[PDB]
Amino acid sequence: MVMSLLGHYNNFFFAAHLLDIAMGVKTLRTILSSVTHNGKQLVMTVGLLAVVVYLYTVVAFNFFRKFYNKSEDEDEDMKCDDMMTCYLFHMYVGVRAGGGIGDEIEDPAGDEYELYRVVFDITFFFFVIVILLAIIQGLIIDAFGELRDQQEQVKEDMETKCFICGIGSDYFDTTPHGFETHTLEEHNLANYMFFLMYLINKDETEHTGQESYVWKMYQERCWDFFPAGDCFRKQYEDQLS
Amino acid sequence: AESILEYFRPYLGRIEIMGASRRIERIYFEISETNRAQWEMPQVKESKRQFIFDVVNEGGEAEKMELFVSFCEDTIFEMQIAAQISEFWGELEVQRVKFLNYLSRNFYTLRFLALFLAFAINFILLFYKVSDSPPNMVYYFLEESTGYMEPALWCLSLLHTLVAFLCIIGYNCLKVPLVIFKREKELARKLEFDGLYITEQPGDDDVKGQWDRLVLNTPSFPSNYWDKFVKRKVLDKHGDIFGRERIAELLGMDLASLEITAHNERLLTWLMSIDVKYQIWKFGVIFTDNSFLYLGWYMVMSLLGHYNNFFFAAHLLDIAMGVKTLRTILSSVTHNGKQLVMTVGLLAVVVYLYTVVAFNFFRKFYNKSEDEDEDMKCDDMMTCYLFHMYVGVRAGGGIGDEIEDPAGDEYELYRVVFDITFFFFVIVILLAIIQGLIIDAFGELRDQQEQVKEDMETKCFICGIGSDYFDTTPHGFETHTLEEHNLANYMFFLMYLINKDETEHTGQESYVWKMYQERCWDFFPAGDCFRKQYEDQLS
Ligand SMILES: Nc1ncnc2c1ncn2[C@@H]1O[C@H](COP(=O)(O)OP(=O)(O)OP(=O)(O)O)[C@@H](O)[C@H]1O
């Protein structure tokens, strides 16, 4: 509401209300869940990117200072003199280069350190380009699998157990639609709610012998009246049906 | 009796063993307040948690109870090593141990402080400047209008090396006296119960098993182990089969005939009269610790910092060893190192196969030569190989984006085929494996936590019976694994036997005490739970 209020202070502030599609759309919010499922372990990864290039700056600040002379012609950049510029040259240009840092510096054809600089660059392309940005691209692929198997657990367990007595469906199905009739007539997750609406909306002097026993345990918050182990079929399976 | 049976619960231990009747029995005892208080501590709460990961994941089943009792003994020594450090001629020796106990008491504090100062020095070092003129070039430190910025560097440098040196002495008196006990105990078992140096011999490998040959004859072999009478026990076991005079010589034990008189007959001055063999043995054990070396190497760099340079920019890497979760991401990439080095090695062999081709057919193309004169980076074969590698794999669009145009009639088709394969093979394929060996590591390291989680919540971990049998009773598996078998009473029992009197054992405490001496683990339930036993008779 505040942004829609500052809109009367006519500006480009209504261009921030589009982000409600994240909170609005049903499925679009689910994709945003995966990326936000590993935020704690993804900030600490990009933080590992501002520490490796710092380790690669103090090296090129002492040996390769005569190379970063982005200086065009005339006069004479030298983006390496302070240490608050090469660090801002290996970061604004380094990780954004895509082909390592060796694609923005002088040619190593010179005899001095012709080998010490290639080793310095190739490692910079394998470590902080391939490896250290495949983790960021990899922490998302893992999130989808981490968020897809969750739906299977909340699906493969609702269709196997009674959710109230815990007995697996493999015992009920000794009768046609055994687990089908049990979890829809005996235990139903809706009758157990329609019962609480029944006690509270009744008269206290009208409870029966069983409606009052469960009413007392509900006051003391003792939950020892749910079946939790038996189903009245496992109880009388020996005597009769 | 409700007030009693309530005030005494955090002390009424329960264990469940079998033996001497071929049936499951039950035992009761007193845990005590002092032992109980030492069990819920962050230094111990984590050791148990990481231990279970080392059993249900990479451990066996027949040897599980063996390596469980061993850990249950490493903890007793740790509870003892910690319950003691808590709060000119002889007047100095009293303040030393009173100070070392303060050093090791708060060790993770010093270990964290050196991480803080490493961020201060590296914050300052972000100002240095180069100049070929005094304010052969000089490294003039630049300042933003503040003069005291450099004099603070001299202060924080020597301060950092201090705490980086006290962490060694703290580690030396706190976590070393346990890397020794783990090895002493391991050696006293391969002699008393095996013939590692009597019957058989080390297999000419595993120098760890060979370096211990020089500690047998030392005067004080079991310095930290409990049983200091291991020598007199090995003798009475192999003294007849092997040469009694020979065995009683390998273990030192001079005057074997006169080693009965000890039982028959009842300060900076001569400190130079101490053993040197055992001390060398202990030295060789500490120096091969992966944690002591990194902790020592971290001190050398902080020492060369006085040789003022950019060496404190290497202490930041302790965030790998410092942070809790950051070290876990580094585990995945290091989980496939053996099969990832051999993959990048496959990259230095394919481009070599692509060099000998362009060295015989496409030599007239690599003429990086600009204008004038006439590069020719292809003449030797120690340059095109260094042109297809420094530029080839780093190009991103194959090698065809740095060479002449194939518009010429000669080999207009033989070169495109040469390049397109170079873009599909050593760019897409051979660098999707490197990017793919990491994605697999996360899934390979995530399901591991599920196995150590879906098995702790399904089985008793002691009798192995699944929870599906216990849950025929409300909270069946919930009460069983918290009262009958508890993984803490079975430890609180060993503290109870060792800290008791031998003439006080009951009928059951003594039977389990004898099997513990012979290292026979046939008293754990392992199959029954006293409920499966009496389910027919009564409840
Ligand atoms: N009391 C219950 N005990 C065990 N399972 C239940 C119970 N009530 C519902 N279920 C589970 O839910 C499934 C059927 O209902 P479901 O949760 O699919 O919602 P629904 O009744 O189909 O209606 P909707 O899908 O519109 O929510 C069954 O597989 C069943 O296992």
Ligand SMILES: Nc1ncnc2c1ncn2[C@@H]1O[C@H](COP(=O)(O)OP(=O)(O)OP(=O)(O)O)[C@@H](O)[C@H]1O
């Ligand atoms: N003796 C035991 N036998 C089988 N399982 C056990 C035993 N002791 C603990 N557990 C397992 O551990 C779980 C509960 O303890 P857990 O390992 O989570 O540690 P905790 O007691 O919760 O304390 P913390 O989590 O602080 O270590 C239970 O699911 C149980 O299966």
Ligand SMILES: [Ca+2]
């Ligand atoms: Ca009534």
Ligand SMILES: [Ca+2]
């Ligand atoms: Ca007695």
